[PDB]
């Protein structure tokens, strides 16, 4: 079994560029900037599929 | 299709007591299937009926 | 005349004080026993008790 990828998901090549340090609520988060829209996401939760 | 009788080989059961506040982190997470449960003492159905 | 209302068999000054006490008791600032709760699984990014 290989789980099928759900309809809403966007494919993203990994790159060192995608992740960075950033300030967010008084700590340095491992932010993931998201290439389709460019939104930064300091928290692991709440990120786009 | 038959119900098992010999004791079966169940996957290991990690208990995560969940407090009001806690630092979740997923370093060293298991990749194999593993049942996760919030409460301890979950063997509550003690009144056996003959 | 004193028999018309036992004043819960309390003295006059005790009543006069008692009213003020009712004012202390009904006060919002001392009303610090809290009722009810909300389980939800958010991150505590910016801790404010309120």
Please tell me what DSSP assigns to residue A26: S
List CB contacts of B30: < 8 A, sequence separation 6 or more.
B14
C43/A24 touch (CB, cutoff 8 Å), yes or no: no
How far apart, in whole angstroms, are the C-alpha atoms of residue B27 and residue A30?
15
What letter would DSSP give residue C9?
Answer: T
Q: Are B32 and B11 in contact (CB under 8 A)?
A: yes
Angstrom distance (rounded) from CA C35 to CA C43: 23
* Inter-chain CB proximity A45 and C46 less than 8 Å: no
What distance lies between CA B48 and its chain's CA centroid? 22
Chains in contact with B, counting 3 or more C-beta pairs less than 8 Å apart as contact: none
SS3 B43: coil
Residues of C with a Cβ under 8 Å from any A Cβ are 43, 45-46
Residues of A in contact with C46 (CB under 8 A): 25
Q: Round to whole Å and give the CA distance between B33 and B13.
A: 10
Please indicate the experimental technique that yielded this structure. Answer: cryo-EM
Residue A34: count other Cβ atoms within 10 Å of its Cβ: 15
Q: This structure's resolution (angstroms)?
A: 3.0
Q: Are A47 and A6 in contact (CB under 8 A)?
A: no
Q: Given its phi and psi angles, is residue A42 left (phi above 0), alpha (psi -120 to 50 degrees) or beta?
A: alpha
d(CA B39, CA B22): 16
Q: Which residues contact A37 (CB under 8 A, 6 or more apart)?
A: A48
* The Cα angle at residue A20 between residues C43 and C45, in degrees rounded to 5: 15
Residue with tokens 């068999």, as numbered in its chain: C9
Q: What is the largest CA-CA distance in chain C?
A: 68
Bridge partners of A33, per DSSP, are A40
- Asked if the Cβ–Cβ distance from C45 to A45 is below 8 Å, we say no
Neighbours of chain A (3+ CB pairs under 8 A): C
């Amino acid at each position: 079994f290989v789980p099928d990828v759900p309809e809403g998901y966007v494919a993203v090549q990994y790159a060192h560029r995608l992740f960075s340090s950033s300030l967010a609520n008084k700590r340095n988060r491992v932010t993931y900037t998201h290439p389709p829209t460019g939104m930064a996401y300091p928290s692991p939760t709440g990120r786009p599929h | 299709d038959d119900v098992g009788i010999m004791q079966q080989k169940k996957p290991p059961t990690v208990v995560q007591s969940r407090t009001d506040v806690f630092n979740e982190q997923f370093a060293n997470e298991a990749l194999h299937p593993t049942t996760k449960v919030i409460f301890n003492g979950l063997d509550v159905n003690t009144e056996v009926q003959p | 005349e004193a028999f018309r209302w036992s004043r819960y068999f309390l003295d006059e000054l005790q009543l006069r004080r008692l009213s003020v006490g009712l004012r202390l008791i009904t006060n919002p600032r001392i009303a610090r026993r809290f009722n009810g709760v909300r389980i939800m699984y958010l991150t505590d990014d910016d801790p404010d008790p309120d």
